Amino acid sequence: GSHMILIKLGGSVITDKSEYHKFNKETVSRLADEIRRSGQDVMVVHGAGSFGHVIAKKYAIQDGHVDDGQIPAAARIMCDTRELSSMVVEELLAQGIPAVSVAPGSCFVMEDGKLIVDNEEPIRRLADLGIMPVMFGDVVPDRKKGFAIVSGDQCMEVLCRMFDPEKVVFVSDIDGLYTADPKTDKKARLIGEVTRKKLDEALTDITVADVTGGVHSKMEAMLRMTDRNRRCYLVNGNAPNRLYSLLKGETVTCTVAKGGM
């Protein structure tokens, strides 16, 4: 029975998603301070954001190795993501939280979606030493393909099964899960609770307005981080002291998922 909270710092918060290689030092500094002020044992995962998505879109890194022109682009992403992780760890180090960057593209491989972690000793030993192992979204060598992209969500799934955290927190730049896109649609209302029946009901699309199933995908990503016990919270990292309050256990504006899968 661990008392650990597994947190994901989405790339849309720690980075300016619209400006390549832009770091929101201000925001990550406050979030790290909120994590320290909470006094909770945590494990941090962060996304790539602008430190990965801008190049991955131009050279189609997600589709794998098709031409030799993506090799310099793939190497640039891995340098950018490791540089971004340095900026995240620096904020944690300044808050008295010893951590270390663990780049998945240099430790693990991928196979049809699964980020394969065959050796758990380095991460487990670093966690036993008090140095928080920080995994992040990265370009990872694939087996059936040349390279593949791992997201912060997938790094969260691996550490979730490895350490069995008591709570999972998703830190995004929005108030939570909505019935549509708030940055586009305004008629959408935040979804407060996410369960299995709502995930199954999310497959219904009478007017055919969510073809890609974005709401269903975001719901499933939260439920798979939940047990019969463990809960998952999607909180706005741009709201000052909101993550701190969530880590203290008090009620905040967020999206809660429970029940498990």
Ligand X SMILES: C=C(C)CCOP(=O)(O)OP(=O)(O)O
Ligand Y SMILES: Nc1ncnc2c1ncn2[C@@H]1O[C@H](COP(=O)(O)OP(=O)(O)O)[C@@H](O)[C@H]1O
Ligand Z SMILES: C=C(C)CCOP(=O)(O)O
Residues in binding site for ATP: 8-12, 49, 173, 178-183, 214, 218
Binding test (CB under 6 A) with ligand Z, winner from 44, 92, 99, 139: 139
Using the rule CB under 6 A, give the single segment among 71-79, 84-92, 118-126, 175-183 that binds ligand ATP.
Answer: 175-183
Contact assessment for residue 80 and residue 36, using Cβ atoms and an 8 Å cutoff? no
Instruction: List the interface residues with ligand Z, window 70-89 (CB under 6 A).
Output: 77
Instruction: List the interface residues with ligand X, window 202-221 (CB under 6 A).
Output: none
Give the contact letters, 145-184, x = binds to ligand Y (CB under 6 A), - = no: ---------------------------xxx--xx-xxxx-
**Tokens describing residue 183:** 């940055």
- For the bound state, the minimum distance from the C-beta of residue 85 to its own copies, rounded and expressed in Å, comes to 8
Contact assessment for residue 165 and residue 230, using Cβ atoms and an 8 Å cutoff? yes
Closest residue to ligand Y in the complex (CB): 10
Torsion sign over Cα 212, 214, 216, 218: positive
Amino acid at residue number 42: V
Selection from its own copies, ligand X, ligand Y, none that 149 binds (CB < 5 to 8 A by kind) is ligand X
The partner residues of 23 in beta bridges, in order of sequence, read 15
d(CA 15, CA 22): 6
**Strand-pair category, 231-236 with 99-102:** unpaired
What angle is formed at CA 108 by the lines to CA 107 and CA 111, rounded to 5 degrees?
A: 165
For 41, how many CA atoms within 13 A lie in the half-sphere containing its CB? 12
Closest CA to 146 of 59, 211, 232: 59
d(CA 117, CA 176): 30
Give the contact letters, 144-173, x = binds to ligand ATP (CB under 6 A), - = no: -------xxx------------------xx
- For the bound state, the minimum distance from the C-beta of residue 139 to ligand ATP, rounded and expressed in Å, comes to 14
Contact assessment for residue 175 and residue 236, using Cβ atoms and an 8 Å cutoff? yes
Q: Site residues (CB under 8 A) for its own copies?
A: 65, 68, 71-72, 74-76, 78-79, 82-83, 85-86, 89-90, 93, 96, 98-103, 105-109, 118-119, 121-123, 125-126, 129-131, 133, 141, 143, 146-147
Q: Provide the annotated binding site for substrate.
A: 48, 53, 152
Using the rule CB under 6 A, give the single segment among 85-93, 146-154, 160-168, 197-205 that binds ligand X.
Answer: 146-154
Residue 51 contacts ligand ATP per CB under 6 A: no
